[PDB]
Design a protein around this ligand. Sequence first.
Ligand SMILES: O=P(O)(O)C(O)(Cc1cnc2ccccn12)P(=O)(O)O
Ligand SMILES: O=P(O)(O)C(O)(Cc1cnc2ccccn12)P(=O)(O)O
Ligand SMILES: [Mg+2]
Ligand SMILES: [Mg+2]
Ligand SMILES: [Mg+2]
Ligand SMILES: [Mg+2]
Ligand SMILES: [Mg+2]
Ligand SMILES: [Mg+2]
Lengths: 337, 337
Amino acid sequence: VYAQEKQDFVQHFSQIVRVLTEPEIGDAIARLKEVLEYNAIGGKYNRGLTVVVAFRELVEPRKQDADSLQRAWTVGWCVELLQAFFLVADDIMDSSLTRRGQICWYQKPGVGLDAINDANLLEACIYRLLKLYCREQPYYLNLIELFLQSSYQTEIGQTLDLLTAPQGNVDLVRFTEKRYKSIVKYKTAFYSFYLPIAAAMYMAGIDGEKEHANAKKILLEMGEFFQIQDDYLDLFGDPSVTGKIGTDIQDNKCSWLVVQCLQRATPEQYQILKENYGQKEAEKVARVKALYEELDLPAVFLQYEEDSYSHIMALIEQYAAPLPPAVFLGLARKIYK
Amino acid sequence: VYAQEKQDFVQHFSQIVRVLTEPEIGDAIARLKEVLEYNAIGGKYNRGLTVVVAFRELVEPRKQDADSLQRAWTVGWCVELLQAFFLVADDIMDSSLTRRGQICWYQKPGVGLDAINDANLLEACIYRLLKLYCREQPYYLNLIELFLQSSYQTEIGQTLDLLTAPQGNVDLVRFTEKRYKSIVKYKTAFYSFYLPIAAAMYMAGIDGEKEHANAKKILLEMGEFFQIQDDYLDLFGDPSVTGKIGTDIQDNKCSWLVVQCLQRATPEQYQILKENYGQKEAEKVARVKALYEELDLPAVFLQYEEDSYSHIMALIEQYAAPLPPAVFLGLARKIYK
Ligand SMILES: O=P(O)(O)C(O)(Cc1cnc2ccccn12)P(=O)(O)O
Ligand SMILES: O=P(O)(O)C(O)(Cc1cnc2ccccn12)P(=O)(O)O
Ligand SMILES: [Mg+2]
Ligand SMILES: [Mg+2]
Ligand SMILES: [Mg+2]
Ligand SMILES: [Mg+2]
Ligand SMILES: [Mg+2]
Ligand SMILES: [Mg+2]
């Protein structure tokens, strides 16, 4: 229901790029186009697609005219651009090497820290598109405020991520479950699943407070799992599938893995972790990975995935209504594949 | 009329910081407070003050109640935060050393490229304040759109700045007057003088298109001069007054000085510039400065300042009405001091 809506979502990028790219600022426009083409393309588009899919499912098909549907694709593309803005900056700050199957933008010869302003431009495009396509709609300001507030929450999460993961500075006692859950709520949960569903809600005239809170209850939990998965895949994923080289151990991250490791470790295993975590030497990173395997963390992850799936399902049963459960079911099929 | 309104503008920062700083995200809130205190303080506050001053001058004193005035200080503080967000990022990208009399935030031990997310947070605070204080006002959306569009224009200017000034890559023929004027229009003119005056207009219910275009005609020119001055002061200013070490020559910038140099230089002077521009060696930078002095660029700047002042004055006579000319006069007194 996604799979049979992509290529058309993806096909529309060319039109997104064309309107954003319409004499003195020509060189700047040409660089924006480069930035958009390198950084908003090559991922799974599940976040932008979710706006489109949910919009079809929430709006009476008789309001689903040609212009309404165009606004849906645009707002979905807005969500993709929000992602792109954050990832460009996140790769700089995480010292990452590849993303989406190619070198990180900032690693490109001749880009480097210019990418900071490139990221800002991507953000700015969100609001340019919103004005261009949605300014006359009753939900215009709901959407603006949703994107801005989603960004604020994400940056507060990015702040906790980076605080709790200081370079050169082991301190494993920081890395707790309570801490972990807060980081990922803010850095991932809001802008990943709440944002795109909430956007389609607003566009559908569903603006109730209580209805947004109920959608949250499900979507924030989905987002938590998705970040736990992302952390597991950072060490245990195949870079040719994920499209990126993992950095969590060297970056001293409060990864779900290091939290689960800490819950399990013998005092002697503690010392091996502390001696080897947070450092750039492949040797030391390999030692951490072998401790994690010693501790059967891959099996612990597979069990958590099953229990989290059942949990999200429980939550859909409690909280979906009066929204079509398919809204939440489609999404959950996509993330727990 | 500024001078006798500062300390009260400045005094209000403590309240700005307090509301933005009101359990899981505590560490992140504490870091936001640090960021705000380091980066939004220690400048001249002329941009934020202009919102306050212009608001008093445009709004009938009987609408100027306690809440209206509080909104004015807040929106002025919004303009200061926009500045702060841009400068934090600009210092990274310009490889700068000091700002406002202290080391650049990103140069702080233990900050570094975390400052990218700190800058984003500063941006986000703009819109948090707008919601907190202005959400019920008829000009709420005018203001949001003004700040967002001001940011977009500034980032397009930052894009031209950085394109035209590539590291390691002399090409002096890029550095033209036409090019220069476009860079500075976008990177400085909009968010420096148009923004704060326009904000006070909107808050005063002055939302006419034509009235905003007329205010622009004056304010965009003021902003151009202000950037020409900034460039002159980069090489010829006293760092204990400006509060910052200059980087333009080493950063290979399309500075007004290098443009004026190029207009004047003997073919042999051309080669000295080309041989020495855009490089980190103090020796080579000193050679550029001595060419500029050879060419009497300080005298050329002083003459341009006088002619630009007379021009802006001409423009105030043409375009101020029906706004109080004092709006524009106060500002011009402050910048051509
Ligand atoms: O690098 P990835 O792709 O593994 C990563 O997942 C990227 C990520 C997660 N949440 C955010 C929020 C803002 C910017 C990037 N974000 P992580 O959090 O692990 O850096
Ligand atoms: O570093 P300064 O203070 O000399 C500088 O004037 C800073 C500056 C001017 N215009 C902008 C726009 C966005 C961010 C910074 N901006 P410059 O343009 O010369 O970098
Ligand atoms: Mg990260
Ligand atoms: Mg990352
Ligand atoms: Mg990751
Ligand atoms: Mg600059
Ligand atoms: Mg600079
Ligand atoms: Mg400068």
